[model samples]
Target: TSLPKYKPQVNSSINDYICKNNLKAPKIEEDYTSYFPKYAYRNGVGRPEGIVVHDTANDRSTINGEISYMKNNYQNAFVHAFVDGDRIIETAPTDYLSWGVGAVGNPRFINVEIVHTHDYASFARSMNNYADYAATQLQYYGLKPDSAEYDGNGTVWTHYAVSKYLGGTDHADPHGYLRSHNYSYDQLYDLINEKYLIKMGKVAPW
Candidate 1:
């Protein structure tokens, strides 16, 4: 995999913070699936440049449920991973394409769907885990874990952003839902960015 061309501005502060606080990437278990012939690509494979964030919108769904549904039915829509509670479930491989953001978006970005119970505590836990997983992926793909105005900056993105800016899905997910839980975009960015800072040797693991 190749690294993005340049690091964005968030790197400096996050690097300093990590060095100062001795922070580390949050420990989490990430799981994956076998590559299938039934995905965005005929074989579900591609190099991803960014990460797209999502909310399941189902208040009562489990990682097993979502994964089962994708494997069993949904052929036109899929994601790379699903974050439920503390588990990071990989439904599709990061190098493959899932029917995530639509035509233009899926080929270039990785997607992570957060399974929400709409319960504040559950959502918060899942969100935190999602951030950790995404940050790790950003570093893997040579992206900075920062949010940017556009996709090429190697920034994390919302499905809504893909809809508006990338011409794909039209759902405004995880935004309204996150706001309801008092979770700010800054918080999400910071959580992911901090992890990248640690990975870049800007800070030592705690």
Candidate 2:
């Protein structure tokens, strides 16, 4: 399968996605200093062990809409990365904890938000894309998803999974639309596992 193209240009819609929309950056100390030349984690912590995905749960379909919501209520929650179809926008540095996954034990987790509503097909495709890119981030961080070194369970996980043991609330993400859909978390899991292996210079299981 062909991989989706990942551009390193950062946010091309800062003006449109933020200023024009009157959206402010999430409550943080990031000056977007590191996001200028690159999107890698700036702090010494480097990248994260896993990527936790979430939906906006709001009416932010268009670029303007997403930015407006960010401007209006991003202080409550935020993610490191946000993807809408062909666009991948990094709202903050990977080192800083986005307000999304909570603050208790997020020191080693990366949060990625896929832009979608209750649409299943779009959700599936976007998730597939997320697995690919998220795998890249994981590898860069030196965390192996399937390696025995991970103690049989690598760091890659979901908001639902982390919330269970991390003192957070329940997250039924990709769960609601999954009830009647033919898709399975196992399929997405396999995709993530395969990409992680490929990134490690090994053959894919699929």
Top-scoring candidate (TM-score): 1
| Alpha-carbon lDDT, every model | 0.67, 0.53
Model 1, span 1-206: residue lDDT tens: 44342233343333343335543334544454454543443324555667888888887778888888887654667788888655777777777777867787777788889887556445556655787788778888777765753553546888777777767567776687667666755566766775667567675444
Q: Clashing residue pairs, candidate 1? A: 45-96, 46-95
Candidate 2 residue-wise lDDT, 1-206, digit = tens:
65432221223222122223432222222223223223233343565656675655544476446655664565676567776544556666775565666664356578776666346434444555666766766777777764211132456665666665664646655444333345444444555665666677675322
How high is the lDDT of residue 90 in model 1? 75
Estimated TM-score per prediction? 0.76, 0.64
Give candidate 2 misplaced runs (Cα > 4 Å).
1-44, 117-121, 146-153, 178-181, 204-206
Candidate 2 global CA lDDT score? 0.53
